[PDB]
C-alpha cells in the first residue's frame, strides 16, 4: 500500500504569508493527489485534485503542484478562516490512503484570556456534587496557568481543563477549568477563586466569589 | 445540492454487531459508488468499504481490517448506504463518514460521521445544570454563560444555544473522561452584559444513545 507522508505534522504562520504543506508518497502516484481540508468537529472538504485542479467554490488562494512522489498545497495568503487540518489522499493504486494530515495555526497578536468564574448550581448542589467552573475566554497563545484556592488553600487533584482547538473566526483559543468536590467539602468553605496567568496578563487574575452570596 | 446524511453510531460491546445508514440527495444515486471512511485520533482517515453501481454488480471493496467483518450494501430505491459490522473490536472506535467517490479517484462529497464506541461500559445520559451569570462572570460590557453536560457515556453529545439561533461567541469544550470512566463537558457562550435578564438564554443538549434531549435555560 502507498503511504502518504505529511511532514510537517504542524505548521504556525503569520496572516497575509504564504504556507506550503509537503505531501510525499513512498511510490510514484503520477499526478493522483487529492487534497482535502478539515475543520474542527466538521467534514473533510476537498479542495484539489489530480495535483492541481481546484474544484469550485475554493478560494483563489488555494493552490496544488507537484507530481510523482512530492506534492504541495499552498496557500497565497493565509486568513484566520484556513486554520484547520489538511489531508492528501491518492488514488493512483488501490486501496486509496490517506496522509496524517498538517495542522495549520493562524498567530495572531497576544491576547490575555476574559476570565470569568461559575458556582455550582443550587440545582447541582442537591445532588450531592458542586463543581465550580473557571473559564478563561479568547486568549492567545495558548499557553495558561489556571489555579484553584479554596480559603486561600492551592487546590490539588480535583480539576481538570479542556481547551477548544484555535477559533477560525479569532485565533484564539479558549480554556475551562472545573473542579470538583463533594457538598460537604464544599460547604465547609467560603472563598472560591480562581487565579488565572497569561503572557498578555501584566499580573495574575483573581476570578472569586463567596459561598452563598 | 448533494446531502449526505449518516445515522446509526453508538455504543457496543466488543464483539457486538451494530448498521449503519446513509441517505444521500442531489446526484443520481444508481449511478454511483458509495463508501464508508472513518477517522480515528490514533489512525487518521482510512477507507474502509465501497459499493460501486448495479450497473457493474453492485461490487462491494473492503480494506482489509475489516475484511470478514463488515458488509457494505446499498437500496437504490432509498437512495441509502448501509454498513454492517459485526465482531467489532475496541479499534474500530471512530467517527464514520458517509462519502461518494467518483469513480475511483476523490471522495468528493462526504457526510457529517457518525460516531461508533467499541466499549464493554454501559450507556448513561448526562445531568444538565446551568452555568450562571453574575458579575463574577461580568468582564466589562461582557458577561459569560453556559451549560455544564456533566456524567455521560458514550460520546457524543451536541450542544446548541436558542435551537441553533446563537452561535456567535459560543465555545463548546471537548470533553473530558473522569475517573469514574464518565465524560463531561460544558458549553459557554459570552454575551452583552447589558443582555442578561432581557433576553433568554437556553442550552439544548442532546445525548443520542440515551435518548437525552434537555432544554436548560440559563439565568442570572
Known amino acids: 500500500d502507498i503511504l502518504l507522508t505529511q511532514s510537517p505534522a504542524i505548521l504556525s504562520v503569520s496572516p497575509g504569508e504564504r504556507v506550503s504543506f509537503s505531501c510525499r508518497a513512498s511510490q510514484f502516484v503520477g499526478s493522483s493527489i487529492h487534497w482535502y481540508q478539515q475543520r474542527t468537529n466538521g467534514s473533510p472538504r476537498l479542495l484539489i485534485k489530480?495535483?492541481?485542479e481546484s474544484m469550485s467554490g475554493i478560494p483563489s488562494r488555494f493552490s496544488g503542484s507537484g507530481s510523482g512522489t512530492d506534492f504541495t498545497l499552498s496557500i497565497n495568503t493565509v486568513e484566520s478562516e484556513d486554520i484547520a487540518d489538511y489531508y492528501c489522499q491518492q488514488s493512483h493504486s488501490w486501496p486509496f490512503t490517506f496522509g496524517s494530515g498538517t495542522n495549520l495555526e493562524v498567530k495572531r497578536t497576544v491576547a490575555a484570556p476574559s476570565v470569568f468564574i461559575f458556582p455550582p448550581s443550587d440545582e447541582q448542589l442537591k445532588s450531592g456534587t458542586a463543581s465550580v467552573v473557571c473559564l478563561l475566554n479568547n486568549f492567545y497563545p495558548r499557553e495558561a496557568k489556571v489555579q484553584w484556592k479554596v480559603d486561600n488553600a492551592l487546590q490539588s487533584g480535583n480539576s481538570q481543563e479542556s481547551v477548544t482547538e484555535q477559533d477560525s473566526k479569532d485565533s484564539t483559543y479558549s480554556l475551562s477549568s472545573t473542579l470538583t468536590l463533594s457538598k460537604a467539602d464544599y460547604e465547609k468553605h467560603k472563598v472560591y477563586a480562581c487565579e488565572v496567568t497569561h503572557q498578555g496578563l501584566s499580573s495574575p487574575v483573581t476570578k472569586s466569589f463567596n459561598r452563598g452570596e | 445540492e448533494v446531502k449526505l446524511e449518516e445515522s446509526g453510531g453508538g455504543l457496543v460491546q466488543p464483539g457486538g454487531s451494530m448498521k449503519l445508514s446513509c441517505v444521500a440527495s442531489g446526484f443520481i444515486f444508481s449511478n454511483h459508488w458509495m463508501n464508508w471512511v472513518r477517522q480515528s485520533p490514533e489512525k487518521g482517515l482510512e477507507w474502509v468499504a465501497e459499493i460501486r453501481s448495479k450497473s457493474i454488480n453492485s461490487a462491494t471493496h473492503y480494506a482489509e481490517s475489516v475484511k470478514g467483518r463488515f458488509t457494505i450494501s446499498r437500496d437504490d430505491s432509498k437512495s441509502a448506504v448501509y454498513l454492517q459490522m459485526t465482531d467489532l473490536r475496541t479499534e474500530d472506535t471512530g467517527v464514520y463518514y458517509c462519502?461518494?467517490?467518483?469513480?475511483?479517484?476523490?471522495?468528493?462529497?462526504w457526510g457529517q460521521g457518525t460516531t461508533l464506541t467499541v466499549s464493554s461500559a454501559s450507556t448513561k445520559g448526562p445531568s444538565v445544570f446551568p452555568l450562571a451569570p453574575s458579575s463574577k462572570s461580568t468582564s466589562g460590557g461582557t458577561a459569560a454563560l453556559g451549560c455544564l453536560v456533566k456524567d455521560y457515556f458514550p460520546e457524543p453529545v451536541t450542544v446548541s444555544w436558542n435551537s441553533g439561533a446563537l452561535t456567535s461567541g459560543v465555545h463548546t469544550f471537548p470533553a473530558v473522561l473522569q475517573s469514574s470512566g464518565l465524560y463531561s463537558l460544558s458549553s459557554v457562550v459570552t454575551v452583552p452584559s447589558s443582555s442578561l435578564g432581557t433576553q433568554t438564554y437556553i442550552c439544548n443538549v442532546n445525548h443520542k444513545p440515551s435518548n437525552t434531549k434537555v432544554d436548560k435555560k440559563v439565568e442570572p
Open positions: 489530480y495535483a492541481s
Open positions: 462519502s461518494r467517490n467518483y469513480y475511483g479517484s476523490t471522495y468528493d462529497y
